[PDB]
Write a protein that binds this ligand. Sequence first.
Ligand SMILES: Nc1ncnc2c1ncn2[C@@H]1O[C@@H](COP(=O)(O)OP(=O)(O)OP(=O)(O)O)[C@H](O)[C@H]1O
Ligand SMILES: Nc1ncnc2c1ncn2[C@@H]1O[C@@H](COP(=O)(O)OP(=O)(O)OP(=O)(O)O)[C@H](O)[C@H]1O
Lengths: 530, 530
Amino acid sequence: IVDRAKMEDTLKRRFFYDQAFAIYGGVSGLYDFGPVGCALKNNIIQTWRQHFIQEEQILEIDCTMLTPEPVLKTSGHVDKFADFMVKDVKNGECFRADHLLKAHLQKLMSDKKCSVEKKSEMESVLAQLDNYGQQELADLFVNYNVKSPITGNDLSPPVSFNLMFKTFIGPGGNMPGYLRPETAQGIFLNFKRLLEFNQGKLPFAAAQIGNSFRNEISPRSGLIRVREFTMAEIEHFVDPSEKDHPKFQNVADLHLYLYSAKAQVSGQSARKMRLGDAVEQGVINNTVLGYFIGRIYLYLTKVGISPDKLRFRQHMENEMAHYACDCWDAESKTSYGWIEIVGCADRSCYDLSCHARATKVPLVAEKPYVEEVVPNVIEPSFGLGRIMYTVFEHTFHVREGDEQRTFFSFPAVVAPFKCSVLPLSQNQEFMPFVKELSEALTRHGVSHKVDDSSGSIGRRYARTDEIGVAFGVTIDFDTVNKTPHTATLRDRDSMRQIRAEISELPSIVQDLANGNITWADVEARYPLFE
Amino acid sequence: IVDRAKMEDTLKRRFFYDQAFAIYGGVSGLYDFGPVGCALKNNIIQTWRQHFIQEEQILEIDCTMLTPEPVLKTSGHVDKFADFMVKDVKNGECFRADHLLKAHLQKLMSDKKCSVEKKSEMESVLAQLDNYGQQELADLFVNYNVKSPITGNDLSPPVSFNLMFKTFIGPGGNMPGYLRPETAQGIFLNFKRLLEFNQGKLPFAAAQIGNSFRNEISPRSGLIRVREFTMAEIEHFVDPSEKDHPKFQNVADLHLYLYSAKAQVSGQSARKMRLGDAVEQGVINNTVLGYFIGRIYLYLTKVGISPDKLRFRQHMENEMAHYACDCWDAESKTSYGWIEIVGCADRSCYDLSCHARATKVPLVAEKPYVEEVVPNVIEPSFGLGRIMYTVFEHTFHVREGDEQRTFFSFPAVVAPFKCSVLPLSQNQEFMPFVKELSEALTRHGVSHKVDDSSGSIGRRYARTDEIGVAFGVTIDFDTVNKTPHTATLRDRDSMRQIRAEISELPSIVQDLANGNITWADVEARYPLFE
Ligand SMILES: Nc1ncnc2c1ncn2[C@@H]1O[C@@H](COP(=O)(O)OP(=O)(O)OP(=O)(O)O)[C@H](O)[C@H]1O
Ligand SMILES: Nc1ncnc2c1ncn2[C@@H]1O[C@@H](COP(=O)(O)OP(=O)(O)OP(=O)(O)O)[C@H](O)[C@H]1O
């Protein structure tokens, strides 16, 4: 139960992100990222690269964002990629029917005058919103008589709204284009060149880390709903008859919350199963999908997401994407309820085929005389924007001190900079120490910054914790005058300190950040400091 | 004099880049980058970060690409950001007048029937093309009677063509938007928040590394002219009365080719002056601009650009950008002649003012009672796309061998991967060595890859050189059987080899790549290997 308000204030004050074109009134769905935001955003992407691209030796390509209409028409986006929109007959004001109806029912279930018999009924409606097609939503909008949230006017019937941005490539109108709503397509149009890289055998995964555009109808979720964001997508091309992953046993012992399609249609809750048992009992189709669900869980967890607030929900029969036949979304529980931050879909083979036909260009591989096959693809899609935000709410805390200080418990691999070196005097008495410590840290690969801000050592850290800095080393006079020269090591979360020689701290902070040593261990080997 | 044709073939075969939406016929100005392309593209950006952001402790932000019309209207892009376009009256076919006229004169100067008196005259015309405004170009198009390049029909008079892409943010048309043709604007709209970071003092530089869009009229220069590219821009906010840079003495002894505005209007050539002498003789206005010109020269040179093919040309009076009052472009001589790859402009203070007014939001700083001032900004703009391409032509070579093999002499800091470990047998006899070498290299921070391709050791490298791999270590039977165990170190460019213990090579390759040791030194300490 995080206090969004108080948090958003800290994220904007320290400038993690903020409204884009603020001095012009701003634009919904558009935000800019400040220094700290970029540092944290870059750490997440780098962590992702090591976790997937590096770990699975994935190929990398960087395709264009502009796309000629024909390409997206063949993919089915020009037809099925949209959201149901509604608007009051009085003025323009557009709203995403899907969500509005969801916010309306929550208002009715909240009202005490609501009977248990109804509150229950409405729950069955919400837990099946992504299914209700064109007509079905129209009925609910009439049954519950939904009306504009503000100055409640009459709402027009629900209609489709293509979420792709429109443009024109080159002078004239002969070539109408769009801004890619996803990156996947780019990888498909380059399947042959990519297939050639792996000698021609399967499986093999291609990846992309670029920006995608979504002309979202009415964004009101901060960074959760933007019309422009960076997403990392992997296209795991596997043979339809070989949907088995060799490394699955690496994540078979993971206990994570699964919310199958059945559990949703049978009105029951999500179960916390073992990834292996899940694949066994037929819950999770194959092991390829299961391996990725594990890799995903691990990544999100390693970045800072809370396990007790993370679950994988399976799509419904008619909730499926136009290009999918099965999918599982990694949802994180936030102040906006459960929201998908990573979509692991199973586009059986809808893409290579469509493009193959439309262009009469064959896109297949061969196996052992020899047979050709159309590669089935499992696509783990990461929304680096939502993942970062979820980290904010899952690590944001308010110190128990009356000063109402806040801080983020960012893991050591995502925090802006691991250590914060802050000395009392910046004269030539401490420089000999600050200098060596700063370089000793660098040799250990520990990102840091020397503090110069004004205020007491206690306030000096209050600002460091605010942006989530993992550790801190205080160099006082006793560090300079006394001998051996010892400095103070401070832990962000607990605020507890330690006193050790200023020459051993480097390797220590390195193990604390690398996860080789526990803060408990530190308090066990070295003398405590109040 | 590089053979573009042969080169483009190698760049596409190894998949550095290629036509985007190829199976759909492709689109001019749009290209995708393959694995090697991405590796090299990422090395350049990383090298840039260390050279500028890290070296000058520049602040970093990441703004949106979508921009609401009002913002670009206030910047003057909706009015002056365009290119003169012409088209034959027969069909659509659009052409950039600016260039077409330039290609026409070159055809006339090439023809032997052309007299010296005329060839000279035309040169004076080309060396002043970016000046000729609306009317002036119309005359030349009539005087030289320019006509469509293909099936030469009659060309319509030259007219302006806004290069920005058009779109609509959100449902409806109440909010018309554009795709940022540059990043600078984003940094200006966030001036206050950024100014606050530096306590409020000047100077201070903000930066951005994102994509920009340019609806280029008719792109025919491969990667030189794209409608989508990644650009790194720095906004050095300095006080108008303090246009002096403290570090200038770090690049004062640089001898680079300068092509002042005068030299262009006085029909004379470019001089190779000393950066310091240039600022003295009033050539280069201030030292702030001079420091950056040096930093730029160093970066481009460090990346792989040839000094004898690099020059800094100063803009003409009416060639100035709508937001500039003075500028210098770093031009590289390529198969397309001199092209700007880095634009270092001096937008005196045109931006902060425009936005300040239009929104009635004050954007200024203060100095020592105290006075407020409108920061003058020097904007070094890097087109990471053109810089990479220039590196291709300036490092592409054809082995003297009849097999017509090619290779790129990529510096160690940009090559896909510094070293290439290739063993003869991949059995369990060499693994103990390949393993240790691979890890020893990693501990030294040397990017590498174990070769598995088929063919003789000589052909194994022919493919490694093709993508520009700096070095290579061959592990043969003598490395396994003999003792001490020695491997062969091979230099890409010279193809010359060395024989040293397989345990010392790691540190050696590290110094060769880091530039601590010369290949000559290696041949001086260790025994040569034929
Ligand atoms: N507007 C957005 N802002 C930020 N990230 C987004 C946005 N829309 C989608 N994503 C990211 O892309 C999603 C994967 O693609 P997907 O097509 O499943 O989105 P989606 O199903 O349409 O989600 P939504 O129900 O929120 O519209 C990631 O789960 C999510 O982080
Ligand atoms: N179409 C393009 N493709 C790749 N890079 C580009 C393109 N257009 C501009 N750039 C990059 O941005 C330039 C800086 O901005 P600038 O406004 O000076 O471009 P420009 O003066 O319009 O150049 P041009 O004469 O080629 O149109 C860098 O010098 C160049 O690398």
